[PDB]
Amino acid sequence: TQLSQDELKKQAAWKAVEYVKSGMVVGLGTGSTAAFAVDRIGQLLKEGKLQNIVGVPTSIRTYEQALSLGIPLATLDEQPKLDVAIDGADEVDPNLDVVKGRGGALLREKMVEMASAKFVCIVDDSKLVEGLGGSKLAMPVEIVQFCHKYTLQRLANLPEVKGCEAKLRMNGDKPYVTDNSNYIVDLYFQTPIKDSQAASKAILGLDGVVDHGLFLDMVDVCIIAGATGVTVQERPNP
Template identity: 35%
Template sequence: MNQDQLKHLVGRAALDYVPAGQIIGVGTGSTVDCFIDALAARIAETGLAVAGAVSSSERSTQRLQRHGIHVLDAGEVTGLGVYIDGADEIDGQGCMVKGGGAALTREKIVADLAERFVCIADESKLVQTLGAFPLPVEIIPMAAAQLTRRFAALGGQATLRAGVLTDNGGHILDVRGLSITDPLAFETEVNQWPGVVTVGVFARHRAKVCLLGEMRGGAGGVRTLTF
């Protein structure tokens, strides 16, 4: 079983966390694509009713709508029971690095609406310390040079992600070389820097559950981590 098959496995496992008749939060990325497809198949097979979804990206919105799943604007809801999304990294406390797909700001907005964040990921995303994956930071362009210097002072090397605009029209800095030993303190600090829209550390909005696809003796399985 390869990495793509593990993504399909955890995408299906996440269906157990979908509350019938409610609006759910849906994230972004290849693993979430698997969840959306599994959700649509379950609706077709069993008649599972969901009242709709709040999506964190145009990409996921389009996929949901192609399956006939109603998408609501975040401003139309006051809360969500669950938000299901992937991660680029997740540690043993449920803190994550997210934003490889450049949707981190909208992901954090939707996560803030939800009572519970369910992370779906394959085993390669589980780490002891965040930072091996380049940290995405959505920024205001005029602050790029100053923010690059500030990350350098922390030991990080920030580079502008070429040719990428977020759904909000922002730019992305990818920061390499960090070791984020205190994710909540790091997120709190960087979010205060002028020019930062959102830093891709999810500590305040950490996962409550992680469904981790992993190999077990040549076969795939799902391990459930709770935080």
């Protein structure tokens, strides 16, 4: 009630930075919640409370932010194994399966976080969903440019996502393009995806798809900030 969404995001972020220890290679997430964690890491480095940190950014925005804070930076090519990654999420379900990449940086986030021994996800409690898709907001699929209308229709008609709407993401007059020159088809649900693993496999199995925003069996710890306080949720059913 008194705590704004931004204040909750920052509370979750600071709790997550407690998983960062001196000497670690850290995956630096993207978006407004992650930006609070990047700033906290930068602050702690400046204060000498952390030392010998290398960050791997997941977006141009994060690269620029971390560079401005003086955080040493590397790429996955240079540091292919990360100790901890901290990132936000667009949706979090009761399994700690998440939708990510809605705002961009989908594949980079996925590749960095798959390379991380511990993935700490930070959210305010508005990101909790009954099931993936349940926010009714975009669930992104990265696709090749060739025959993108065909692929969009193919996606919308996959049994595993039956009932969704699908829209090619536009950047004004031109289709939006990812870091890898691919297009995005956003899927929109009115009820959650029933079997997220089956949906992930079916979408990846579609020739023409590069990747998608279902980040399954990846998050190890979710930090959830809400009006009542901050909850640290280890992944259920280990």
